[PDB]
Amino acid sequence: YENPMGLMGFEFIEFASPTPGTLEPIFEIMGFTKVATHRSKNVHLYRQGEINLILNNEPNSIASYFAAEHGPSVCGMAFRVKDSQKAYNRALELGAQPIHIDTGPMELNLPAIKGIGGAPLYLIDRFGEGSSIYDIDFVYLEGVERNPVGAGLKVIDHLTHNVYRGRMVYWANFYEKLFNFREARYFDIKGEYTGLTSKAMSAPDGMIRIPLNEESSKGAGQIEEFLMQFNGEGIQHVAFLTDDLVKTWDALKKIGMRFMTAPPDTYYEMLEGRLPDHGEPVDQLQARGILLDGSSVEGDKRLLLQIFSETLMGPVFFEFIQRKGDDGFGEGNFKALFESIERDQVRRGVLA
Amino acid sequence: YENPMGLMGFEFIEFASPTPGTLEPIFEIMGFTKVATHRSKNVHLYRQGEINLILNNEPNSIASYFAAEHGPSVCGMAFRVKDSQKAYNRALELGAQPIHIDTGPMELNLPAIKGIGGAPLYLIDRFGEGSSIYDIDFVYLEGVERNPVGAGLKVIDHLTHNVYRGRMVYWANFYEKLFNFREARYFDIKGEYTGLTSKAMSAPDGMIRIPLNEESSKGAGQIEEFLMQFNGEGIQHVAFLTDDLVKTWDALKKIGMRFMTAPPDTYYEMLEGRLPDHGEPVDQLQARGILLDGSSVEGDKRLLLQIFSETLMGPVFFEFIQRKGDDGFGEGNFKALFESIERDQVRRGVLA
Amino acid sequence: YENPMGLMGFEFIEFASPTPGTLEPIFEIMGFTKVATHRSKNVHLYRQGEINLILNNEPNSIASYFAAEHGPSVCGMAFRVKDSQKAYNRALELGAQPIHIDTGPMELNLPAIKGIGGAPLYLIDRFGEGSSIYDIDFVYLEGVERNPVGAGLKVIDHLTHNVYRGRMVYWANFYEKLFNFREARYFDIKGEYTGLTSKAMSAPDGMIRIPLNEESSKGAGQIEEFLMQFNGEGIQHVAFLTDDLVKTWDALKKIGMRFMTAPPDTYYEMLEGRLPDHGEPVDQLQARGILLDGSSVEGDKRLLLQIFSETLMGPVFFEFIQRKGDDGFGEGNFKALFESIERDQVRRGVLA
Amino acid sequence: YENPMGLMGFEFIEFASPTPGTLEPIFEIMGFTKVATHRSKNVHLYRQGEINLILNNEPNSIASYFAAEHGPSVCGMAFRVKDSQKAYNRALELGAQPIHIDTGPMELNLPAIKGIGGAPLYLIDRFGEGSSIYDIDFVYLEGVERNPVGAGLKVIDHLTHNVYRGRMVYWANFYEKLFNFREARYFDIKGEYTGLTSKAMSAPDGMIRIPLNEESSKGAGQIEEFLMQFNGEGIQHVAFLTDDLVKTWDALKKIGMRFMTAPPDTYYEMLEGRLPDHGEPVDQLQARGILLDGSSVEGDKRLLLQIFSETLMGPVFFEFIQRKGDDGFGEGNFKALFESIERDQVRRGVLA
Numbered sequence A, B, C, D: 001y002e003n004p005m006g007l008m009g010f011e012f013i014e015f016a017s018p019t020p021g022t023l024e025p026i027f028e029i030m031g032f033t034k035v036a037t038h039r040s041k042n043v044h045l046y047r048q049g050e051i052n053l054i055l056n057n058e059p060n061s062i063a064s065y066f067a068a069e070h071g072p073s074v075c076g077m078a079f080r081v082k083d084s085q086k087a088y089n090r091a092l093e094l095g096a097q098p099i100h101i102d103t104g105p106m107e108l109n110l111p112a113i114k115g116i117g118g119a120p121l122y123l124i125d126r127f128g129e130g131s132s133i134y135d136i137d138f139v140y141l142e143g144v145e146r147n148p149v150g151a152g153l154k155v156i157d158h159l160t161h162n163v164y165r166g167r168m169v170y171w172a173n174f175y176e177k178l179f180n181f182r183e184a185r186y187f188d189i190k191g192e193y194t195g196l197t198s199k200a201m202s203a204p205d206g207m208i209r210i211p212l213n214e215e216s217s218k219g220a221g222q223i224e225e226f227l228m229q230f231n232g233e234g235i236q237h238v239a240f241l242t243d244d245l246v247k248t249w250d251a252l253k254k255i256g257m258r259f260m261t262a263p264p265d266t267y268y269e270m271l272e273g274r275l276p277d278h279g280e281p282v283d284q285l286q287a288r289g290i291l292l293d294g295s296s297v298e299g300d301k302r303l304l305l306q307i308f309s310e311t312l313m314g315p316v317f318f319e320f321i322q323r324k325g326d327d328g329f330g331e332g333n334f335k336a337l338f339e340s341i342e343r344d345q346v347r348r349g350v351l352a
């Protein structure tokens, strides 16, 4: 697939909250470590593997207005590009809206366009060696390890957008026209009482992936609850890749992670019928509540293991995923996740 | 009611569209005349009575980005205030987000904050005589009458906001906190198959009024259909005051106005039951499809006459109102409006 | 004479000083009254007749930086123009360097270019009729008379520029090229020990006149002394037109004005020789030290009456002039002014 | 000596011209090589040893207005500091005037204040390895040697400021107050008909040195000539250090350098009388026109070898210097330089 913006994956995710001390604990429970402090702003860098999470507590700024609206949330998203000048000019030619971010003496002039819910989308062409943006804009803490391993999360795998009815098409067009993303798959998920629809959008770099979710015709489901609780469209869950989910599970549990309620025993009993010869240790999945899906087509096994945290920032939750030959998404996991969140809505008295 | 910003009424409404030549004919059909052109931008002043409508076709600006998103629409609103510097500074202390608008040589530096759907909310303290803002920022057309009467519309009476489920509270708070509006009345309107809920918000000047509308629990109605068609929250209808609605209705009709479908004969038959001694010429109302409402309490009659155009700007429609003692809104008129739009939904095949 | 920029006279002169309370007393001793205070800045409006003098005590601004360098001085100058947008854009196409001035809510965006010594040159197209720039940017003092008469000064007649050797040509070019001024007359003035050279530059409106002064080959004179005491090129004296100089002289005297030392009695004895039939009351001139000059060509008498204060603002001095048919300058008066300042040098010990 | 600004030497010098292709040849004759091109502006990097010379040909900027006024010249100067935030803040607290420079996406925000004649003075704290400003803001040419040796010029030694009469004190205070420079020496140089006065200011880092030059009482000399031809105050000559002047002379000669007329034979005949035991090969210096000075105090020899280029950019000339134990300036060399420029004045017909 052609890549006109020269997209080379996710660079960083940015966070903001109206209440001081609410994001720090979250990041620590998820295995992240504070590693540097911006040189003139009140913004901090948290890291795990190659994941860069930016904590922005800058007063009177884009981030502080965004957090007064949405609560604790993802307030920015940066993609890596080959050439920021070229990619920023191309996006303005194609109709994107520019966002100006102020900087101090000797800091970089990072370009950005408006994205989901007003959150900036940054186009960064300075990464990896020599000097990354963090080497120039930030000051590393005295003595800290600058590349912590944490609980094994490596890179950002994918993130979702929960959108109002009729806007799945709008956000598909945004990423199709500006970045040449493509609809890799379409889902129609039904729970016991409610349901949803989704389009899994993939970027041409084969790294950035963004599932776009919208409520069903019925209404009363989890997508509509998100939209009310977040006060608009936004990133509903962020997913981190790991090379070994059970091991990561054990490490997150030790430090305070809170996962979703596991599926019933029935689910684990039907795995072999559904995925003949998967090969995974059912005993270890079922003890942890891990979901298993993918295909088994004449010897060729492509699997997907997924597990979700409870909501931790307003309505936003996180996901720890391990791919074994499957580069897409799976309908059974999606359905399990969906039934889990629907039971919680009954539990809480908000549905039927 | 206390007025801490020193509000003094609406100053102007601003409109944009992505296709050139779509707004001119709508203004012309409502009785407005073009009277001036801005001195450096591609923006035009349309007037009737004391109503000032600004047509903004300035390329690569706030208004062009807003119209690419929403279609023909209301992209800006200005309020009259006693001292712009004090009101602007008090907004900014109470959390409002400032919006910067570029200006050329010798033009006014108009202050604004972000409002409904991102549309700027201006805070103007130079009006009336001596020089208004149109005297300084616009050049009147050679020989045109600078104060046209048109079809009789006088001032902007009110305008609505159609919001997403759960956001009526959000917008009520925005106006209560920054300007001290108050909820003057609550409505719960039910059609044949659908319904809505609304809060009529009143500013402390007794001039600015903004009903806030949201869809019912059942969904599928007209508010949800506006949100999808508009691509977000926005001003659903703008109402203009007239001192004589049957005369304004005849004027409007001559120059092409397209009004909604009238109520059935049954409605006009029940008027005397419901409003004993109203004193209005039923024969005139009924042939035009005008709606009559208010109260008849012990000889004190406080009436409201309303009529609505078809949708003219995407899903946005306009209202022509005459007040005869009633300063608020009427439930019976709200119902008939709602039932009429509901029947149109059924006719277009979008409802049940 | 063609007028491409639409010049229409002087609009205002701006002053600054590094010591608080040094300019106030000098304005009051020349007949000016404070009449308004800016709406957001620490800047005050001083007025007499149609002369507007702006006292700028704005901290951390162009004016504060300029006064730190030069001492009490003229830091700005504004010209009236027909259309600011056209004039400003023509200036920028002919190489003029733009100067941005910040402004608060609802204030005018005044365009300016760099002029003598970096002092901004404003281009104002809003004067007289309806609302001036003082009506929009300033708040008049409770109950003070908005148009005071003072001591009879009416308008700014002219103002000089003292320049470095070789820069008369440079400043003549600047005004010729941008506004089409012309060299109306050239002077070569010699004292007892020193001398100077000067180009009287005239604008195409018949109102703005700027004499440009430079030191002679000999050096050690009064222009060189100004340039060291002022710390650069700048406006050396500002002249105010009056319709009656002996009356203004009496008024100025009563409020504290200090005038230069008078010419010796010889001067007044030779007036008839030099200007047969001048017709002026020699007895009144001689008792006040007024200078008289011009021509007497076969009946046609074009006279000039001039008087100069002592230096009041570092090396800057002021002039009170009455024109009786002569629209230019006089060589005899220039010489007497020169000889008087030369004797002052000798008196202070700085010359020979 | 205390160093409050944390000064650590010169970082770069910047040049502009109104005529294209006038600076490229000058740099090439002086042994410099073009090594990179800015990533978004029309600015180019030239290098020799640790010397970085920036060629700024960016339209409608500070540089293009500065060049229209002064002709080919030094338009910018950058010092190295430990912390640009701290140094920039300290300089604004002490009265310096800020200068804003526009930058593109992912470029550094370089801070600067106003210096000699308006030319910016940059405060850069990013140098040496990791990434210098050139690694971030520029794009190295494909295949070129990034660190060329040229003719041996190592670093910038010093540079002068020619100032108007009475401004030696002004510029002395500027550097004393902001950066704590000190007057290391004072010269009073007389030629045959004219003379000058000078203060050698030294920075506390013992690297930055700036001799300040002003015309004598007599007038008509070479400083006054510079001021007219440059159209104001500015950098009259820039000096480059070399470890071997005779070998640098030979390589400069080869590629096109034009040196001043050497001193008469008489001057070399007297060297031994004035500097007993200097030890330098007089044959090699006299054939090349190199100037020799310093001291010979009981065995301890501190020498200075200097040679000057003809004027190459308007009235600006260059110096190639070798220090042999003398960290200051020499009065004989200054006098010989002065006599040489004076004779050229007589040759050209501008003096007596």
Ligand code: EMC
Pocket: A014, A015, A016, A056, A062, A063, A066, A075, A076, A120
């Ligand atoms: C600076 C936008 Hg989170």
Ligand code: EMC
Pocket: B014, B015, B016, B056, B062, B063, B066, B075, B076, B120
């Ligand atoms: C520029 C606001 Hg429609």
Ligand code: EMC
Pocket: C014, C015, C016, C056, C062, C063, C066, C075, C076, C120
């Ligand atoms: C702000 C010009 Hg004196």
Ligand code: EMC
Pocket: D014, D015, D016, D056, D061, D062, D063, D066, D075, D076, D120
């Ligand atoms: C870009 C200033 Hg010479």
Ligand SMILES: [Fe+2]
Pocket: A158, A237, A239, A319
């Ligand atoms: Fe996911």
Ligand SMILES: [Fe+2]
Pocket: B158, B237, B239, B319
């Ligand atoms: Fe209405």
Ligand SMILES: [Fe+2]
Pocket: C158, C237, C239, C319
């Ligand atoms: Fe004068």
Ligand SMILES: [Fe+2]
Pocket: D158, D237, D239, D319
């Ligand atoms: Fe030198």
